[PDB]
Design brief:
homotetramer; mainly alpha; Four Helix Bundle (Hemerythrin (Met), subunit A); Helix Hairpins; binds potassium ion; membrane protein; Tetrameric Ion Channel; Voltage-gated Potassium Channel
Chain lengths: 236, 236, 236, 236
């Protein structure tokens, strides 16, 4: 039990453990590539047993379930294994296949279950030493970042309402309502700035200028929040 | 008096005070949602007693006025109650309902008062300690932010003048005048960058490149201003 | 001499000096507003004595020349009066009127001399206490800003070359040559991001992705340069 | 040998050394300008001996090869000469001419070798005192910048998948597949924001809003990484 546990959990234990970690990384990358390529227009049909993409998916899922079963059996205690995030992300990454397999042997639910496979990238943090530190740094500042998001929501509602009320007098305005102007306000406060929605009126232009100024303010506001978490997790 | 105080003002004093604060936050959120929703194209008519949006608005306004009256009567000092901003934001948020009610029982004046109701968001700062801290941090750096805004205005005027004078030789130019170029210059100095207004001439392109460089400078500039206020209120 | 000095130069000396400084600020603002408003299509025709804009310009120029002559006569040293930038910005701002007046009593030369009036904003630095400090902060980091501009130029040339050579295989590409791609590359490295020029090819999209990443790098790069100048002039 | 080595690679050795460095900078700039101007439509043909754009190239390449040969012959040892980056970049800068010359005396391969001439800019680092410091600062932070790029890739894959799956129900959507959405997700996470690809659905707009928020996060992320490298290489 301990031997296989250190073989599958500690890649630095031996060369075989490093090989296992490398093959796990390769399988994760292959599954991600297959998931991305499956949606290409020239590959989709208008699934089945003979589909090569299906075969690669079965191989990846078989490896994932074998690794998960081995780790669960070799875990020192079941509660810790079931409570660890790096294992819950793995158990979420396998269920969408099994739901699909049951139908082989309503479209609204099909929209989300096929989506959940994107989380396959998340066990890369296990094998990436730097990514664990980055995740810890992000988590340590999650409260202040949430507060910043709340402030951004306040500003986005303010500017959306202002621009809609200043643009109500234009017959060709894109802003039909504040819920419609939310997209523009959040794409302005965060400095992306698509050309698909811009004010045309003078008052709308003034409100947009104020929103752009607030966006300049808010693109630099979380910088001190990132500091004192970064430069802090690297020296101690 | 003192019984209903520390209860309508201090949620942490008792469970009843926490319940009152929670219901106040819920009413604020409901009023904000109703304000944003009522202008949707499928909801607006082309007000009245039977309108459900009107009923929810009356409920929210009744709760707001009851809370404001209770707080005013229970305050230990009438002088500072009016001077406090957290109460002026409350008293502004109730006026537009009463103006609307009088007409039920110049159109430009009607649009601004309707916009005034959007200040309902600001009472959320009372129940959010983090928002109070963020507001204090922003207020502590108001003067330097104003200086930065003045510098941005100087740059925006300079670049609008430059781009208009460089673009005067093009018959298809969007920049008809310096006020027209103001929108583009403030959209460039801020890194939003809409595609609705771009120079087409070579000299216009050079001026736009210089404006973009100055925009990188002007949004990388207020970072140290936010610092020494953040990381300062959280450490002292 | 010394009586009108410390009065035309030091507003804080007496109430009369403060009044003179206030009237100078008002004249500068009026001249700037008139300059911006003169180019509006409604006011422009398709100059003369009876033009109200011309009258306001003559009043502003008369005040400027009177103030400059008084300051020059009252200065204790003629050598440094010309060398000081706050006086050279004044002396450029008066020239365009005199050139225009001579014609009333090659068109490319006419557009630049009209343009150079934009520098009327810069005398506001004399009467703004914080603008001088901000200018000193910017000047103290001029060399590193120039280094950053040189790096940005290197990156812009590299990415323009890459995108043009990866996009020449498309008949509908906007990039006709490296100078054409310069505009897109400097619009991408700076995070303005206009939609007027975007790659359409796959290789063009990859090069654009790399340019956008380098743009994030180059917009986050000058922040430490602004620091150690800001927070340095405010503490020492 | 040592005398000419000091004359060539040490611009501070004498006035002649400074002259040699200046002429090398001038030749590099001339080659860059010629390379950029060669692709202009007014100059391209639809090469030969009489082409002036070929003669300037021959002169630049002759100077480059003379300098390279002199430096190689005057070097103290061959290993460091062939291992130093500022010399290997010179090696890459001369080969493309010789390949072109052979043909005068598979088309895609002929195009990439033309592209690789862009590296002519990189010899400017030798003669720029501050560019070496900037390169050292960038190199010292390359390990963490790679991790940041990896995080950006994870986020870009996640958001591309989310936006494609949310936008699958729209017949007019621009997102045909996850690789198509990769361009938009990069353009969003980096705060550039072209208007060529935007979601139109409500769920697509929500996913785009989340991607923009994460883009603000990822543009604020690398600032602390640049610090502790800057302000560190310039003080010790
Ligand atoms: K931006
Ligand atoms: K943009």
């Amino acid at each position: 039990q301990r031997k296989v546990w250190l073989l599958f959990e500690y890649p630095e234990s031996s060369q075989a453990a490093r090989v296992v970690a490398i093959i796990s990384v390769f399988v994760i990358l292959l599954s991600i590539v297959i998931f991305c390529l499956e949606t290409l227009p020239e590959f989709k049909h208008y699934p089945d047993i003979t589909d090569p993409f299906f075969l690669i998916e079965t191989l990846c899922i078989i490896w994932f379930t074998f690794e998960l079963t081995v780790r669960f059996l070799a875990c020192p205690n079941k509660l810790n294994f079931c409570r660890d995030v790096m294992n819950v992300i793995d158990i979420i990454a396998i269920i969408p296949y099994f739901i699909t397999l049951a139908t082989v042997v309503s479209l609204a639910i099909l929209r989300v279950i096929r989506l959940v496979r994107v989380f396959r990238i998340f066990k890369l943090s296990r094998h990436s030493k730097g990514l664990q530190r980055l995740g810890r740094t992000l988590k340590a500042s999650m409260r202040e970042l949430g507060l910043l998001i709340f402030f951004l929501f306040i500003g986005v509602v303010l500017f959306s309402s202002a621009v809609y009320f200043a643009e109500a007098g234009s017959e060709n305005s894109f802003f039909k309502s504040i819920p419609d102007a939310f997209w523009w306000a959040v794409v302005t406060m965060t400095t992306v700035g698509y050309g698909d929605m811009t004010p045309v009126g003078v008052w709308g232009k003034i409100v947009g200028s104020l929103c752009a100024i607030a966006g300049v303010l808010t693109i630099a506001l979380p910088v001190p929040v990132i500091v004192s978490n970064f430069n802090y997790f690297y020296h101690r």
